[PDB]
Design a protein around this ligand. Structure first.
Ligand SMILES: Nc1ncnc2c1ncn2[C@@H]1O[C@H](COP(=O)(O)OP(=O)(O)OP(=O)(O)O)[C@@H](O)[C@H]1O
Ligand SMILES: [Mg+2]
Ligand SMILES: [Mn+2]
Length: 529
């Protein structure tokens, strides 16, 4: 009812589109009278493509959490290690809520009810409100779509109000970063968005809320993909953006659980989402056939270049390198169903893209190295190279609402109970200045998952002290030692000392506890220069 929407503060809504169907979203997006960033275009693959506007990725500098008596003593605050949980006053929150609700008043609104979390006992019932059809399409794809029975008794736990078309004229007076905002209030259980149209703010916004609620009751909440083999063996793949979680979990030899957000409770690993959000830059049908074949009607392409004849130039990063496609998870042929969950993970894989070309393609981690590298959360990026490091705790600090050690504690507990083994995989660069091929990386993953490596003979990489298998079927043995891809081990050593120092400085903040101090021994060792 409009009276219900009025309770949220939204007035005078003339048209309400509740639970829009995929067919209706399709015709909404292709309405030939739409102008601006609402407009979609039809590609020859059958999927609609849209432009997300000035924002082609998340805006962490615009993310704020209301600091009140619910969040004061439990949240990981940016002003109290480096994170994006910047404190917001309740008073300023109310002005922001006024901006969004006024913007959505007097509009035709899409209302999408969905779940975050595959399990009833821990899921959030989220109600999304937007005036942009492709934003409703995004959340229909990425969250769990309820059954008709579940919709009948749907009671929202959280409300997400997307006011992308409004901006905040008072941001200077309020001490905020810009006229845009992505704000959360755990007392009202609400997310507000202004200025940025980018859909994934809602996806990662609710992920951040799961990351707050689940560990506080003993459930790991993880930035990982996950899949399961025929023998019932579950694997999770942690990693930062672009390191290969979606690419590598979408494997026809295994049943996909999910590609990005999972919990781990007493029964096992469960997906938070109802879809996958794949990168499309330079997408190769031969290298990633399952992802490519998911691009069809009801998938939603973002910021790709579409030619006059409707074909897609997947290689064109002119608008952004972060070209994306969302699709409901059943667009992948080999998935777990009807519920995206499975048992306890026994293989835990940390993906990293090492632009420094130091780390080996695959290492088998000790228990302490697992905690050290989990808290470190390393990746790096590249007419100059300039390897630029990122240390993002738990491979997802941008989404952590509690302190990193709280995620580590619950993860270790779940791993120990399951007898899980951890591995570090460099999906990035070596001495060639090229990325390891997807073919080689998939073969590495195969060798991890089939037990090939759990007792294989190893040699130890200096300084990082990582155990590397001496051989691995399907991979050229030469590349297993990263020193072999340089003219001499001396070139590698110089870059390794740079990276080791980066790790050591970054890890210092964790040494104010005895447990954290103890983990220094498992990290890289550097005592000169
Ligand atoms: N050896 C490799 N392994 C994995 N991915 C690779 C490799 N070489 C190149 N790539 C490319 O790197 C990108 C990996 O992106 P992917 O979508 O898997 O990241 P992600 O970890 O899911 O990030 P996000 O959390 O942002 O979704 C893809 O564009 C893929 O084509
Ligand atoms: Mg992904
Ligand atoms: Mn992600």
């Amino acid at each position: 009812t409009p009276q219900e929407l009025e309770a949220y503060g939204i007035s005078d809504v003339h048209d309400i589109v509740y639970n829009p169907s995929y067919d209706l979203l399709y015709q909404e997006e292709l309405d030939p009278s739409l102008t601006g960033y609402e407009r979609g275009v039809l590609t020859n693959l059958g999927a609609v493509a849209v432009d997300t506007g000035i924002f082609t990725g998340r805006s962490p500098k615009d993310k704020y959490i209301v600091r009140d008596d619910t969040t004061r003593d439990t949240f990981w605050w940016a002003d109290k290690g480096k994170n994006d949980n910047k404190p917001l006053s309740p008073e300023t929150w109310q002005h922001l809520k006024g901006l969004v609700t006024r913007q959505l008043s007097g509009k035709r609104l899409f209302v999408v009810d969905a779940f975050c979390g595959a399990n009833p006992d821990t899921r959030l019932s989220v109600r999304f409100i937007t005036e942009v059809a492709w934003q409703a399409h995004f959340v229909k794809n990425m969250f769990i779509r309820p059954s008709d029975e579940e919709l009948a008794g749907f009671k929202p736990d959280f409300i997400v109000m997307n006011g992308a078309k409004c901006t905040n004229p008072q941001w200077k007076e309020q001490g905020l970063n810009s006229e845009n905002f992505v704000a959360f209030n755990l007392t009202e259980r609400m997310q507000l968005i202004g200025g940025t149209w980018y859909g994934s703010e809602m996806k990662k916004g609710m992920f951040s809320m799961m990351n707050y609620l689940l560990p506080l009751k003993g459930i790991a909440s993880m930035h990982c993909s996950a899949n399961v083999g025929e023998k019932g063996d579950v694997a999770v793949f942690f990693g930062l953006s672009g390191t290969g979680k979606t690419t590598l979990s979408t494997d026809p030899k295994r049943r996909l659980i999910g590609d990005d957000e999972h919990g781990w409770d007493d029964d096992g690993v469960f997906n938070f989402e109802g879809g996958c959000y794949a990168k499309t830059i330079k997408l190769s049908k031969e290298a990633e056939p399952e992802i490519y074949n998911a691009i069809r009607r009801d998938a939603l392409l973002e910021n790709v270049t579409v030619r006059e004849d409707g074909t897609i130039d997947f290689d064109d990063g002119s608008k952004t390198e972060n070209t994306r496609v969302s699709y409901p998870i059943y667009h992948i042929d080999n998935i777990v169903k009807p519920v995206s969950k499975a048992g306890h993970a026994t293989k835990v894989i940390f993906l990293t893209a090492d632009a420094f070309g130091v780390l080996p393609p695959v290492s088998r981690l000790t228990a302490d190295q697992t905690q050290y590298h989990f808290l470190s959360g390393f990746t790096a990026k590249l007419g100059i190279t300039e390897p630029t490091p990122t240390f993002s705790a738990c491979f997802g600090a941008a989404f952590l609402s509690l302190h990193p050690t709280q995620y580590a504690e619950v993860l270790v507990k779940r791993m120990q109970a399951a007898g899980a083994q951890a591995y570090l995989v460099n999906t990035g660069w070596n001495g060639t200045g090229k990325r390891i091929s997807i073919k080689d990386t998939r073969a590495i993953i195969d060798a991890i998952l089939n037990g090939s490596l759990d007792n294989a003979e190893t040699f130890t990489l200096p300084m990082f002290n990582l155990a590397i298998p001496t051989e691995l079927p399907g991979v050229d043995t030469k590349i297993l030692d990263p020193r072999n891809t340089y003219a001499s081990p001396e070139q590698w050593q110089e870059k390794a000392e740079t990276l080791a120092k980066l790790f050591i400085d970054n890890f210092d903040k964790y040494t104010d506890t005895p447990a954290g101090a103890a983990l220094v021994a498992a990290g890289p060792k550097l005592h000169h220069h």
